[PDB]
Amino acid sequence: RWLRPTPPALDPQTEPLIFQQLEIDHYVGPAQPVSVPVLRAFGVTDEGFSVCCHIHGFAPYFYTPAPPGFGPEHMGDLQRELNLAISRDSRGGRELTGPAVLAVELCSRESMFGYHGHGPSPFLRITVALPRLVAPARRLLEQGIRVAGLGTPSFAPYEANVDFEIRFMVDTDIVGCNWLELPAGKYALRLKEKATQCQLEADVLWSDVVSHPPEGPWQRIAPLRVLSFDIECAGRKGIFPEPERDPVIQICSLGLRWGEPEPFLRLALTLRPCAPILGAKVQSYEKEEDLLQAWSTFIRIMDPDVITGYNIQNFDLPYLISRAQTLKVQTFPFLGRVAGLCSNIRDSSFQSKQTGRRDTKVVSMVGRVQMDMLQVLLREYKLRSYTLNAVSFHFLGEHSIITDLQNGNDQTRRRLAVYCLKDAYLPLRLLERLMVLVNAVEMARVTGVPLSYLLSRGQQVKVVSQLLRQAMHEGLLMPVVKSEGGEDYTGATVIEPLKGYYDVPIATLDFSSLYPSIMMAHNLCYTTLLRPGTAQKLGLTEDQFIRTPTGDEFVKTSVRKGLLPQILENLLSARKRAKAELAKETDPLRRQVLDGRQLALKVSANSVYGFTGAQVGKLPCLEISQSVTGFGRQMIEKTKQLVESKYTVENGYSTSAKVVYGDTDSVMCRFGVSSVAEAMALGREAADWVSGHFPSPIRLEFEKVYFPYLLISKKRYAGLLFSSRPDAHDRMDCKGLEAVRRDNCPLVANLVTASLRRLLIDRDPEGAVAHAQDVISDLLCNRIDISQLVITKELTRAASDYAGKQAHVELAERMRKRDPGSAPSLGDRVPYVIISAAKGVAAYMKSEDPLFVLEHSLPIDTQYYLEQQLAKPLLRIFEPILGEGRAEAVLLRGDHTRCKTVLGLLAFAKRRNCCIGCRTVLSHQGAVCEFCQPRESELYQKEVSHLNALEERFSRLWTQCQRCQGSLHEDVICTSRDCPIFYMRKKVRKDLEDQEQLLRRFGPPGPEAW
Amino acid sequence: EEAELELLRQFDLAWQYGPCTGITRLQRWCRAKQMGLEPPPEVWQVLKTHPGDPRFQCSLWHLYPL
DNA sequence: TTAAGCAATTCGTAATCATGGTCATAG
DNA sequence: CTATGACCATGATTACGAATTGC
């Protein structure tokens, strides 16, 4: 629809180009100037034109040591290494490499690993023509033949085999989303006859570019173009949609320029004639071929930078591609920027111990960038459900019906289009509100990796990139060590608690950035690790090296500076600047998203240390990891000895303090005073006192005062939070307990939060007992919503769940009769509830889908929920304040309240009536019993105040759907399984149905036909 | 039949007769006739040549827990 | 060709081991 | 018609894997 502005008057012999790049690309090419791999770079100007840039003359290489013989110091054998062996038996050694310009170069460099000296050594630099020839050469120089005139006897290892685009960016100092400049007279626009579809197309040599480091005025962001879209399909009853039978009926698109607070384009393409919508364009077609063609032409002409959505990768784009393949439309799958290239669906998997394992499809688009917001949420955030409704409530606050809204009239289709446009608008709001893209651009500028790697890869490519960028400045080469496999080492210490309930303030002192500052201030690195022999026979121990608790020796900083101290120092300053910016916000959600930014930079700095100990990886050095955790243990026991030893009764102070807890970075010391001001004063004195026994940047700091405190086990405690004194209290802290885990029911987590509220804030155990009694009583009397009963568990890799029978695996692998095409896959979460049956050996035989127990009305196992979900967390919490008469107090609270329980063949009812007063079954329909007949005015009085309260609950719920829907004049259709509103509006109809019929036992209060 | 099942499905979604997914089909036909909006005399003449069948004398979504 | 670490607590299922109610037949 | 231990049946203890959170 709307086009980019027109590039007026660029003349290359006088004017430069200044543009900001988004994507890079590799390309094997003809039309050479009179190398074959030429590079592509796509970007945008400071105004809004689209620029493609072709870069020429770059070829991959690596290094290898020159062996000590008469060969690789003699030029005849250098060019003979270039020369091929013409023998017949060298077909395995000069064919797959063959005649390639590997070349011969002599340079003086060093290896990374260890500390041998300040002296370098000769290495050979071996270029290669193509990037897809470094793999057979590696298969032909190490295990292949290297008998060539006795120049290089096998073997010499390969060093610095890295990726092509990463080697380019390490070479020329270009980072992700960078400002690039072509100077005047260096670039030719009309040398390249147009093979792509951008406006400006330059054709430059790889030594002409200028990279501007992002800082000062070069810290801006260009006006990018962002698209979001959503589709609709018309299915059958029960049957989930399939790309060979179910047509695509509506596509809806939103588009904006980045930096402007509203969109500028709003389009909706439908398949029958429709009705107009104010604010958007509407076009209609009588066939699906025209609809797919129209969308492909719009996406070529608008030419967006970024494409977003929600689950567009695994649902939307391959559905469109398969549907275009079935209907024989040849011109659809050309969505990219290159004019002669069609797109294809390709599977990929990712797995780690940090995010688990996920299997995704990818679809190829060259030039353009994809950001599915579902994958960003699934990677960064740990939530309970990952539906669009659930995250839109958590962050903002909100198939067979559609097939008859489309086979109807045109106002129904207009309603369908407004629904689809709201769906297509929600991920834009989430992208701009959560500060996604600004943090992605800052991550790519601090680490130096492209913008497509932050959605596909892990935390290794970034630390490899930063280490290579720091390695070119002193002249070192990296080695290739690979081992399967070493052993584990010893991790962190935890101090033994003094368990219980405390009501005198405890002050928390901890170290900030512990492991990066250990690695900084004792000069630990790959490049300064001293081997056990190379100290000998030199004898200089003092101020030349140090010794660690695991046992290594490491050189002092008066000889070398390591590489990991400098990378860590850069990351630490970036996080410090993020916190300094975060210290001046007032909005809460903005404060937590800047907390998210600084959390991400601290995770990056700690993954630098975790790179060293990963024995399945790219470069492990477990000696360093052992030295780190040994220093950690030594320093925390130093802290505990010092804190408990100095402030004592004989040293003039009030009370000898005693440490109650410590977990590898923090110390919770109990001081003795019950005044929060005096505890805060002595705690600040203690933190600042103890910090002066270390190198720098090692510092201990005061952080909080808990008052009161509740310590249950290791990694399980709770307390109340004081930041200042006249800032009285902030909130609770629930470390580890049953309120922050997601393996349980909402009922149990709510009861634990409410019990700690009534028990820590108001200090009333009697209201707490009465609360827990009411929860158990309302459980047994069958008046608890089934939202509070849903359990969710993650469906991981299928073989570990083959090894032992679980409940959620049994529910998932059991398909439905309605739909063998929508079922949980690997990596998602399965929700279930437990119904009552008589198979007590197996709780995996009583699990059912919440919607299935909704539509089929199966009962609930209240004894399962009473003794297996609720009871034992309560016995954790309520015991330490009292004795074991407290277990008997809650099991007796239960006992006064356990005696109140509410209740094929089911069709053959008799429906025996019963007396309302004393429950005696009898013949006739009158409500009262003959012995309890007098007391009837009181028994009518009783239960009409129950009908009165059910009437008041019907009306508050069924008009809330009208305000959440938007309209007051049309029907509600919302079966949202993540809304408490749904199925709480279903049971009050039946309560009212039952309670209205019980009062017609009594006669009518008058006539009605008068 | 199979042509009489689309006439009723077309009467059920025309907005000028009312917002009807809680009641029967013949009750909505007589409600519009009282106010006399314009009920057509064909959605009546198939609700008379049938008995109490639940796929003629019921709204489209008379399943569906809404 | 691809993947940052360790410590600790909780719950469910099958298997191992203890103990009583019938029973079957020798006295 | 009546003792005795062999036989079936039901409940208490231990072991180990899976899931998830704290540093």
Ligand SMILES: Cc1cn([C@H]2C[C@H](O)[C@@H](COP(=O)(O)OP(=O)(O)OP(=O)(O)O)O2)c(=O)[nH]c1=O
């Ligand atoms: C959270 C976390 C901690 N650690 C280690 C490194 C840390 O130095 C040590 C302390 O944990 P943390 O206190 O969580 O982190 P931190 O001390 O480095 O930073 P800050 O005080 O500002 O919050 O625990 C990891 O190795 N990986 C991790 O993911």
Ligand code: SF4
């Ligand atoms: S059931 Fe009602 S309140 Fe709940 S999400 Fe649906 S429309 Fe909104």
Ligand SMILES: [Zn+2]
């Ligand atoms: Zn009675």
